[PDB]
Ligand binder design. Structure first.
Ligand SMILES: [Cl-]
Ligand SMILES: [Mg+2]
Length: 271
């Protein structure tokens, strides 16, 4: 029945007095969490949702101006949480959604208890005393090339995301979900992503943040995780996954899922 629920393909699993909210990153959808879910449903109510613009969502619902800013997705998340009666959730966000949840937690502290983030990135391009892994003008040229030849850029983007070797599970699956997006919509999201800068707002994120990422993510260098750990306003903790790629929860579940389970269940002590 819910308009908001069907628009983001919301799925509710398990049961419990605490709700775990699962968000996904660019190029994929809530199916990226298939390895984590069966380990949560016994102890938690689990809510999954798709970002607006994902290949699984209605392209007519993608407001290009409203989603030109990160705050537009934040409004969506808050609406989803309200619609399904979610308070003080454990938000587990992958990449983009993690920053969406971070911003949302500032607007609505009541909806969030803490955040577990995977491959989080407050800013893509490098700046002074901030290392994002990419020079700003290089990012701009890569975006421009993505406009001219979308197919070939997206074709090369998939191995970069999945990382390391090789033709694998995550490779074919991420490539599948990546090409289910409408080209102009995917271009819009990348423009927004490469455009935002959460660095001045990091001190305002005051709820506990669990910072998780792979030791070899081409999109997110280790320095980014260490930057978040230092600039977050409240409690924070960092754990690196000894693997390659941007989607460790899909590419290497055997070593990633146990880490996610721990940080979901464990609370950072005071000080
Ligand atoms: Cl992303
Ligand atoms: Mg739907």
């Amino acid at each position: 029945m819910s308009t908001v629920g069907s628009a983001h393909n919301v799925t509710v699993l398990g049961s419990g007095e605490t709700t775990v909210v699962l968000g996904h990153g660019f190029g994929t959808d809530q199916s990226v969490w298939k390895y984590l879910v069966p380990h949560l449903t016994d102890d938690y109510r689990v809510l999954l949702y798709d970002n607006m613009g994902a290949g699984t969502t209605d392209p007519n619902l993608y407001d290009f101006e409203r989603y030109s800013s990160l705050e537009g997705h934040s409004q969506d998340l808050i609406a989803i949480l309200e619609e399904f009666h979610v308070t003080k959730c454990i938000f587990v966000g992958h990449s983009l959604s993690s920053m969406v949840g971070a911003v949302s937690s500032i607007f609505r502290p009541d909806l969030f208890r803490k955040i577990v983030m995977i491959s989080a990135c407050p800013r893509v391009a490098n700046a002074d005393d901030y290392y994002g892994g990419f020079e700003e003008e290089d990012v701009n040229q890569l975006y421009g090339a993505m406009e001219e030849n979308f197919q070939t850029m997206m074709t090369g983007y998939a191995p970069i995301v999945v990382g390391g070797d090789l033709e694998s599970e995550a490779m074919q699956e991420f490539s599948r979900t990546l090409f289910n997006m409408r080209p102009d919509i995917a271009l819009s999201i990348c423009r927004m992503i490469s455009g935002y800068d959460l660095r001045p707002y990091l001190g305002l994120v005051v709820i506990p943040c669990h910072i998780i990422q792979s030791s070899k993510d081409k999109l997110v260098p280790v320095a980014v995780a260490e930057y978040l750990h230092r600039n977050f306003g409240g409690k924070s903790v960092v754990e690196l996954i000894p693997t390659e790629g941007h989607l460790p929860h899909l590419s290497a579940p055997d070593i990633t899922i146990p880490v996610l389970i721990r940080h979901i269940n464990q609370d950072i002590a005071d000080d």
